[PDB]
Amino acid sequence: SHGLFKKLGIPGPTPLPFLGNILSYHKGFCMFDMECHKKYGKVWGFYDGQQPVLAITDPDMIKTVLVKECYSVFTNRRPFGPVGFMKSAISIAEDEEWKRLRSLLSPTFTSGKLKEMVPIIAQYGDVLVRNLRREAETGKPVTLKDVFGAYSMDVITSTSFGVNIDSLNNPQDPFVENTKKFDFLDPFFLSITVFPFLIPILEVLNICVFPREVTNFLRKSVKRMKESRLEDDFLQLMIDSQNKALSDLELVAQSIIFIFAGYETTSSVLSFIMYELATHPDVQQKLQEEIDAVLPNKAPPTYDTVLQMEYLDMVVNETLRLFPIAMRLERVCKKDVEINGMFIPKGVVVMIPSYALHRDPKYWTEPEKFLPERFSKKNKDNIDPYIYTPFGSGPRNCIGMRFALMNMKLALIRVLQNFSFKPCKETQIPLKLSLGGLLQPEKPVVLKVESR
Amino acid sequence: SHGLFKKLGIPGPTPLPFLGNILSYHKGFCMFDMECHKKYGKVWGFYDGQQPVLAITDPDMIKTVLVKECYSVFTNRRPFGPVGFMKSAISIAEDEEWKRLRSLLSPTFTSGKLKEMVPIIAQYGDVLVRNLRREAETGKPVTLKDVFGAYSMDVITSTSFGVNIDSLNNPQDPFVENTKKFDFLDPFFLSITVFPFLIPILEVLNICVFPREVTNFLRKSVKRMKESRLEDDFLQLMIDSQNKALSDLELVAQSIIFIFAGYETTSSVLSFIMYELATHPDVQQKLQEEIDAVLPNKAPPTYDTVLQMEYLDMVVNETLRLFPIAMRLERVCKKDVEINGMFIPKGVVVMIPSYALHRDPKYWTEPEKFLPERFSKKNKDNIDPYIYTPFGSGPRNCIGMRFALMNMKLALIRVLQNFSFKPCKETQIPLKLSLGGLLQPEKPVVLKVESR
Numbered sequence A, B: 001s002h003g004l005f006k007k008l009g010i011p012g013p014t015p016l017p018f019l020g021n022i023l024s025y026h027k028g029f030c031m032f033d034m035e036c037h038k039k040y041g042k043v044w045g046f047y048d049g050q051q052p053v054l055a056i057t058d059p060d061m062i063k064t065v066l067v068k069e070c071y072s073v074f075t076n077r078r079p080f081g082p083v084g085f086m087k088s089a090i091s092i093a094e095d096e097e098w099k100r101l102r103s104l105l106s107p108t109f110t111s112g113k114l115k116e117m118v119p120i121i122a123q124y125g126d127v128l129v130r131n132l133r134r135e136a137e138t139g140k141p142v143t144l145k146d147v148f149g150a151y152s153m154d155v156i157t158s159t160s161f162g163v164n165i166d167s168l169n170n171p172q173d174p175f176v177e178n179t180k181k182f183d184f185l186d187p188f189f190l191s192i193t194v195f196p197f198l199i200p201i202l203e204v205l206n207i208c209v210f211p212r213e214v215t216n217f218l219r220k221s222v223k224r225m226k227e228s229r230l231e232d233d234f235l236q237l238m239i240d241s242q243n244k245a246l247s248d249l250e251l252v253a254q255s256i257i258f259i260f261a262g263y264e265t266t267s268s269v270l271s272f273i274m275y276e277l278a279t280h281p282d283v284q285q286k287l288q289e290e291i292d293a294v295l296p297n298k299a300p301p302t303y304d305t306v307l308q309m310e311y312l313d314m315v316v317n318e319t320l321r322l323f324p325i326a327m328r329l330e331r332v333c334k335k336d337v338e339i340n341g342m343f344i345p346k347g348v349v350v351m352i353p354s355y356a357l358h359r360d361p362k363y364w365t366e367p368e369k370f371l372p373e374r375f376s377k378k379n380k381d382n383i384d385p386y387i388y389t390p391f392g393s394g395p396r397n398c399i400g401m402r403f404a405l406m407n408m409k410l411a412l413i414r415v416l417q418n419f420s421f422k423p424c425k426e427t428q429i430p431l432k433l434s435l436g437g438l439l440q441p442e443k444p445v446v447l448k449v450e451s452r
């Protein structure tokens, strides 16, 4: 099984029996992809256990996988388990059941439904400022992921179920616990990659990478909410759709996906931004000046004034370049195909190393340096959309891209209208990324906060 | 494998392929043991999957297993897994490592160390009264397991680490969460009994019936406490012992056992008592009168005045007869032996059905009726210590029996000095026991509480 890439003429590191190349994940996926990109070039291979993985870095070949041949060949991602009833979640579902779900859930994320969400997402930005001010009037540094997490949590439960909580002042509420509760290099998932034949063992055991309790809490919580608005957010838009149509437990599963999607991602991207803003204080001033020009007297951001801000889009995009939280994009090749002159055998995982491509000196000058001007309208043209892909690409890209950018930008506008963020003695500079299996900081980001 | 009891001449229900007799657990262990005791007699057999289990009800034969041949033959209980680092917990450990631990932990539970604990256990009884009074001055019924659990939780963290919390008013404290977080007939453990060859699968996966997070919280919490009192309760008595000696992670493991031991047990026995007191109001008055005679002016109970109360011991004992939380006692037979004229082959689990023996009409008149006078000093003599065994018997019996009886009695004395407990319209009468795999009520116990 370990002779595949040795046959196809594709180069790669020598796999060990059973382990494959996974000992090379000791420095984390990011550092391993970079070294492979360096040693090997435009295409290489390795083995997650006995699983072949082909990394590709040609943007034409990437467009073929993510777009051109998405429906025919590269339709699903690597099988993930054990998942239990979470098999019906859009990001996990496969082939025609993914296609059905993606459609039933697509109108949820239009710019029209997104503009209805602005006045609601704009209300918890104010709850955020007062929690910062209480820690700004105090003095003690601030841990961003705490305060940003509490905010991102407040946007989720409101934009997805209607529930309204100040989590930072209500850590022991009715749903704030369950909803705060996957390291792909921890003892568990490495044991998967080596023993992926033990996934089916756990699926007959009802054991789940989603704890059987959080899921049990929201499965019944939804069916209370469902039989409450009926008759008298995401949950509403999904229930209206099933009026081939969406099921009840299918509806719970997409809710659970939308929560992790907008909790740790939204709150962890904001912390990469605030770290970079705090360590590049001119970019902070330029941003503060642009907000006050569009929104004078700290005017409330509207859906339209947010898209009006260009230097804010440049800042977000550049932070997503340095910290693309997905790290890699992946598609399971389901047929023997020949894309851009290369034969891909059936069953091979095709992987795009986003992190490595975002930091490639062949496409980016000074790629470690935080330089937002790359995304100025003068230079935004010269950027290859299949090299910089923080939301993936093609029919299977991030369905909540628009919502995530709008959610994070409404947060930043209000927060930078009232605060400046300074490095602390305890602030990790330069921020070390987690040697583990997540795109997260080694030490969490602590910063000083001052009231304008 | 299913031909064993068919060969030995022992009667039993016909086992199905792979499942054995476990479909017969549908009404719970209790009802199944009673029916088997009824249909079959003094000795019978069944199969937990391919595991042979021999039930015995002769008190001479039981004394042989629990006492006479405990060290030689019947030393450990049924293998339990997956357990991870919790293998070193006294109740799980085996043979010489159990013997070493039982010794290193025995002086902890002397009546001398227990008398030092009284003034501390007496302090949270007052915290209990004021939480009841707030729900007694209000009116709304009271769920006993909530308020009793909060109390039992407060005694644990104090008598085992020194930490002091009012959990009922601090549900979101630093340790109250972790510490509040096994149904042997849920989807998981039935899958064990049928696939017990999958336990070793999980032990190479670090997966644990103890969540990897609660254990991680207390493993480090202990090693903070350890290097804090050093230098400047159970944890202290264990640390003094290791001065063949107790280890560090061994010390964490016994702490985790002492917590579940005194949290759900203590708080669930108190609720069986309060249910029975509320549904037999004369027994409540007789008890209230005896406390006021020993402790006039609601005098504070002392270690000695608690043992002075006889009708209180009768009440506890009779409640433990009707609801012996263990349900069964068990020992793995490690040699071919012939005890009381019966050949026991190696590897067979020997089981004593406590619940069924506590309700046997051959030893108890009106065994369902709650009749505390069975344990009056006139009739306490005529009770067979190998028929009524709420704490087991012999070298492997409950190490915290004395502590549990003292802990529960200090609770009852203070609570009955200030409250009467009435049935509510919502009170489940007659209380149905959980059809599941726990000795717990179907519906939780709700009762009215009135201030004396």
Ligand code: HEM
Residues within 6 Å of the ligand: A066, A090, A091, A092, A102, A257, A258, A261, A262, A265, A266, A269, A320, A324, A325, A326, A329, A330, A389, A390, A391, A392, A393, A394, A395, A396, A397, A398, A399, A400, A401, A403, A404, A405
């Ligand atoms: C900064 C925020 C976010 C980033 C950078 C991000 C990034 C990504 C990426 C890279 C993918 C895979 C794309 C591919 O394979 O081509 C993805 C998929 C997905 N995202 Fe996001 N995401 C973010 C937030 C969100 C939010 C707020 C939601 C809310 C619903 C969401 C919902 C989803 C779903 C459902 C998928 C799977 C789509 C499918 O398989 O059909 N994401 N995201």
Ligand code: HEM
Residues within 6 Å of the ligand: B066, B090, B091, B092, B102, B257, B258, B261, B262, B265, B266, B269, B320, B324, B325, B326, B329, B330, B389, B390, B391, B392, B393, B394, B395, B396, B397, B398, B399, B400, B401, B403, B404, B405
């Ligand atoms: C009403 C309260 C309790 C009851 C009815 C009870 C009952 C039992 C029973 C039946 C056993 C098995 C005995 C045997 O196999 O012969 C046992 C064992 C045990 N109990 Fe308790 N228990 C109670 C509370 C506690 C408490 C508060 C502790 C605190 C440390 C504790 C610690 C233990 C330990 C460590 C074992 C295992 C002993 C060994 O395997 O060496 N128990 N209990």
Ligand SMILES: CC(C)(C)OC(=O)N[C@@H](CSC[C@@H](Nc1ccccc1)C(=O)NCc1cccnc1)Cc1c[nH]c2ccccc12
Residues within 6 Å of the ligand: A077, A078, A079, A080, A091, A092, A182, A184, A256, A257, A260, A261, A262, A265, A325, A326, A330, A398
């Ligand atoms: C297994 C691997 C790495 C080879 O393959 C994956 O990718 N398995 C995905 C696992 S199940 C999809 C789901 N995970 C999740 C995680 C924790 C709790 C609940 C759900 C998901 O979508 N959460 C929202 C999200 C996260 C990040 C960006 N946006 C949206 C993990 C995954 C990471 N980023 C993805 C992007 C699209 C689809 C899946 C993923």
Ligand SMILES: CC(C)(C)OC(=O)N[C@@H](CSC[C@@H](Nc1ccccc1)C(=O)NCc1cccnc1)Cc1c[nH]c2ccccc12
Residues within 6 Å of the ligand: B077, B078, B079, B080, B091, B092, B182, B184, B256, B257, B260, B261, B262, B265, B325, B326, B330, B398
């Ligand atoms: C597996 C079976 C049923 C065939 O065999 C058992 O019995 N496996 C015992 C499991 S591991 C011992 C440990 N469980 C535990 C449970 C949850 C969290 C943490 C620990 C334990 O001791 N908790 C204290 C206790 C509970 C009840 C009375 N007193 C003390 C389950 C068990 C039930 N009652 C016992 C009495 C003695 C020893 C073990 C048990």
